[PDB]
Symmetry: C4
Subunit: 424 residues, 4 copies
């Protein structure tokens, strides 16, 4: 999904180097390239390419990978990983069980892996930032070689940054984003040998940068300088409420807050569709289209321009005439269908009533509305008789509902005056 | 498709309950773990995980699964499962045949299995809610070891519910639905050790619950007690809905729609009728109707049922309220009839694909962009008319325009034919 | 793609008829069930299930199928299926070559297959209607056992039809189509044992049938007595489309519905017509009614999601809408002239004031009176007074003409003028 | 994927020409059909089927092919291909490394361990500028210019293929223009297909949807001598945007035409049409965005020459539309405030649950008159200032009427 993950190297020529370990002709790379698996502990600061290296080892070995983290894993996910390796072994395939931050596992959680190492179900790759010998079972260490990874040189971070800019398919290649050398170095200066933070930054900058008239984004050093709980739900809530309250200004403010805090702007796009049916409904049917259009736009354009499309929709909705009459009408219909008995469809409304059914229904026949005056079957009743006198929908007088209210009032008269009435 | 099917456990660690049989170290876990395949009979109450066990077994053994029910399965269905398996065996794969409610099988229906266990084409797994040693051939019971499953403890159901709530990819994880522990317990006590029912209950709660201003559904206890309270009938409802919309009755329209949704009808089936209604009963009295119906469907496609259903209800009310005209519908119908019943006349010379109207009259170069007096029919049926706009909605203006054009045609010095 | 293809049986429990050869037990169904390939000839009258039986054999054997015809296949295609087989062999895959009307190859052209039979690059299955021992070498009769199939019973046909009706994945199982038993009979008689034709009929009926208020189609006996989309498109096809577009361009809804009806009933793809509707919307209507493009997109969207007869109508609604729309080719002619200008003139450089980022000036329009930089010129100086777009007075273009004339006056009276 | 790439033969029954090497019975065909790989150097003029021969061989041997050129390939992408190939061997798959324009260069050790089977392609005698270490492992093969007959067939094959070609796309290639294409290209297959493709892309669509590829169009394509994506392209876009913002439909069409005829991608223009819809029109005309979306949807479903016209329509529409950057600047200001002001809590009455709320539908005019939706610290913040253009006239009046309700309200926050 994110840039960091997308940009993961697939072979040793893309891997930006821990050259003291991987320089061609050395022992590790000879093993990797031969596809010779051995369990390992990888020790290195954040973003040294521990995760990615493990993935590369798997591809040379023609093996599968499962990743887990000692941070967000307890007994449940350990057993899951194990069992999954087990099925993969029964299908005849090899498995690398990668474990991030292994030192966070306690002795007994560490032990759970040895029978599966011993018995060939998995090759184990553990990654940490702390010293391995300090806090891992010696039983583990005796079966897993330790390798020391160093933080990257500036040259190498810069290389990681260019690789991402140049890649036409997984990176920003052919995407009209310019990374000036001055800012490439300034990111290198800041991230202190951490490549993941470096890709994160780049992506953050790409997301935040404004588009000029040519469609180009230039990631200036000035932009760099410039930089799911109840707090989040409350922000969504204040946005919705501002829109409902016809307050476009505050609405933008809440939207901006959700955006800058890393909220998904598609999440907000979904709320705009909901709001289109619940707070506007038929006072303005186009609102649904404005909201669909903003979604469609987000989906085809860069983040900052996408977010402006959604912004446009928020202000459209904040400004629109307001009606909860479809919402209230549909809630009441639901309640009746859930609470009232299962009334049959009256004969005159059935798809193809047989002549027996017609006679069982006391001569009652479908009245085709198009063949009657005004294409209205004045006096007809569309509810089962047990609930003939039912109204759910009360148009407001806002927007288009003004005229809807008049049409309905005029229909209701045609009904009252009709000489042919259902059920009477 | 449903939440119950989507949440099938894939391996032993996802599998909740049956510890009396499955606790690590016992015989069965170990044979499963080794993926060694043996024919079996599983005995237990509905929703105890018989179905899901046969599938976990299959996953460990790297085998394909074929499911039949001695209830909902004819001879044809049964011959199909065996042949499918036989093809698998021929390509070298391993197949499990899971048979639900096996007991409801006469002995001479049971015989039609054994050749298929014996020559390895099938590994057989029977499920039954009733004791096996009664109505099953001893030939079959002599080949299929019997296993007994209990109904689930309350803590078991709670875990099944929690597992479904947390699973992000197959469940409701990262989908802004909350399950308070109280209603977690309430469902546990309601279902009485049936996990299938437990998950359906959960699923029904989610589909029913209202979405708050933050997009959250909270699955309240109130909502739960509230819940304990495809042939002719389905089609009659669809028909009631359509006729109500045609009849400009928005209230009755929402009622029939609501009856369809809550009896488990697919709201997209309704969104399809809405599209049909927009062209058959509204047409060009209001061309925007079609776009309202489209948008409702797209809206449903992007936010799911919770609020999708409401967007379709908006489309329903819109169409109910909309000016009515079947003019396009009857015109098309009559055009198709001319095409089927009158000669297949060649296209007139002036209208063929060619690279005082002696040949083609490019209409943009004439007065008012209209080639007055030009006829676009073959001469044998010149003057044919299909489209008679009503005077409702936009068609008042359209009728006015066509009447103006027909006048230009009458006054034209240049008439075709 | 079509019903007769989708409904190809794929195992012996799906294959209908030929039970004198295939009933549970006999030599043949046991060879097949085991998956043992051997060369074969199928003798039988057209429609019997030769093509499909070879497919069923292929599936039980895990093998590819390459289909050829002594009648319809030229030399290129004969060579192509041999080569594909060779390719499958080098990847360790079995391949069956099915050869229709194989009796129509001579004694010498039949010889050409034996090298590939002998070295096991092909399992050969021929299909004839004329007797095998009659026109076929013994060089070949001795490698292929002969099996004999029978014109299907009108009763086998009914089963074929109900199978397609009741198939949820491949057929009409979940499409709300009812096939009354009288229609089932009536189709059986008409086709006279050709299962493929029975299915083609069934399909014609379902694409024909009207949708009732409940969304059902009922395949009534009368629709039958009222009676090919995959044919190459010839002169007639192209004239029907030209007619349709020209009727629409000429604001004639009735003639337009007629040609459209003619195209559909001749098997034309309604999506083809939908394409033309997107073209007409920009070419013949343009900005006299920009909503026209949306009407045409919706008909397309609606055809994608719904039944044929229903989607065909949504398209009909777009057709009538376009016929009735105000007419303007002004965006069309404007764009043609703009293109002609780009191709025929020097490739003038972007003027300084319109460049993206000048080095070491631009009038941002929103900051001027009226959000108009009155007096600015957006062409290069060499072609400063160029004009392509001449709105008509129809539809929306009346107001657009008014706005444009008012802006030109604004340009006329401005104190600031580019290139002065 | 151009037609050229798309139409690559997949076996020897599809491969056109080089009959001197490939006719049934000769040593090479046999070695190809058998599936047996030997390294090789292929020499012959551009577009004679060197690249496609190599692919065809790979398919018979059930191998992958790694394509590399001595011209455009750095030391890094060379190493990459070797790594991939190794990853292939390890997965049980054979690999052909194809080397375009080998003449300008020691891959030797990867040939022995059969991790790579090597196929070089060259327009110059092999023995000339590459050593005999390589040459003693790789048979040389002589490739010839295609005959007119051969080139006509390559065109017809492309005309008749339903899947990868132009079969059933309503394109007619008259035999006269097929002949002339053969005449102009001088035995080069790739160039033939590129010319076909060019004509397809440029041919006018008639009333029936059909394209006829006539000789006139051929002569016109030949007279195109213009030179062939940097600062120039960006200023063309800039000028288009600016002309649209300035309500000049004529200049806009001219810049759009310059972008198209220079080979720019029309969907790139479509993306700028979406951007413009929100930034320069906004809610003076919210239908503008649906117009751009529709043009885009249209381009997706139809020809190039037609989709391009729908994008033209959208450009003219935007150019004539009332202008407003009110949403654009309002949002920019909201984002600034968000970023630069403190992270104020959501005011209690606007939170999702309590730990107050004035449901607006339950009040007069469905408006909570006097409610405030900002945090107290920045109450009265304004971002959105509608213009008096297009729909924004009525929107300003509505907002002015609303704010007057707020002002006269007995219930006020704070």
């Amino acid at each position: 999904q994110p840039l960091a993950a997308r940009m993961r190297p697939e072979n040793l020529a893309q891997y930006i180097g821990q050259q003291h370990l991987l320089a061609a002709g050395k022992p590790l790379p000879r093993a990797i390239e031969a596809g010779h698996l051995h369990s390992m502990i990888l020790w290195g600061p954040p973003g040294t390419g521990k995760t990615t290296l493990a993935e590369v080892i798997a591809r040379y070995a023609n093996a599968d990978v499962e990743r887990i983290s000692a941070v967000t894993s307890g007994v449940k996910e350990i057993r899951e990983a194990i069992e999954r390796a087990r099925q993969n072994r029964n299908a005849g395939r090899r498995t690398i069980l990668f474990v991030d931050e292994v030192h966070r596992f306690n002795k007994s959680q560490q032990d759970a892996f040895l029978p599966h190492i011993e018995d060939g179900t998995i090759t184990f790759i553990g990654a940490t930032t702390e010293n391995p010998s300090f806090e891992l079972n010696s039983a583990l260490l005796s079966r897993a070689r330790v390798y020391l990874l160093k933080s990257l040189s500036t040259e190498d971070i810069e290389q990681v940054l260019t690789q991402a800019m140049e890649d036409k398919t997984r990176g920003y290649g052919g995407q009209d984003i310019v990374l000036p050398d001055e800012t490439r170095r300034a990111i290198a200066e800041l991230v202190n040998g951490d490549a993941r933070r470096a890709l994160n930054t780049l992506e953050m900058m790409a997301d935040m940068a404004e588009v000029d008239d040519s469609g180009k984004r230039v990631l200036k050093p000035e932009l760099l300088t410039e930089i799911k709980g109840d707090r989040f739900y409350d922000l969504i809530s204040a946005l919705h409420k501002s829109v409902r309250g016809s307050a476009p200004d505050a609405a933008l403010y809440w939207y901006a807050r959700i955006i800058t805090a890393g909220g998904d702007p598609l999440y907000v796009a979904r709320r705009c569709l909901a709001i289109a049916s619940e707070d506007v409904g038929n006072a303005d049917p186009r609102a649904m289209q404005v909201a669909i259009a903003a979604w469609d736009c987000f989906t085809r354009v860069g983040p900052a321009e996408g977010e402006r499309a959604i912004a446009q929709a928020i202000v459209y909705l904040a400004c629109a005439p307001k009606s909860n009459a479809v919402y209230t009408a549909f809630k009441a219909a639901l309640a009746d269908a859930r609470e009232r008995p299962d009334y049959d469809v009256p004969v005159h409304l059935r798809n193809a009533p047989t002549k027996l059914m017609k006679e069982m229904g006391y001569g009652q026949e479908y009245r085709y509305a198009h063949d009657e005056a005004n294409a209205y079957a004045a006096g007809e009743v569309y509810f089962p008789p047990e609930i003939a006198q039912t109204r759910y929908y009360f148009p407001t007088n806002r927007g288009l509902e003004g005229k809807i209210g008049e049409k309905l009032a005029w229909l209701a008269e045609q009904d009252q005056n009709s000489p042919i009435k259902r059920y009477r």
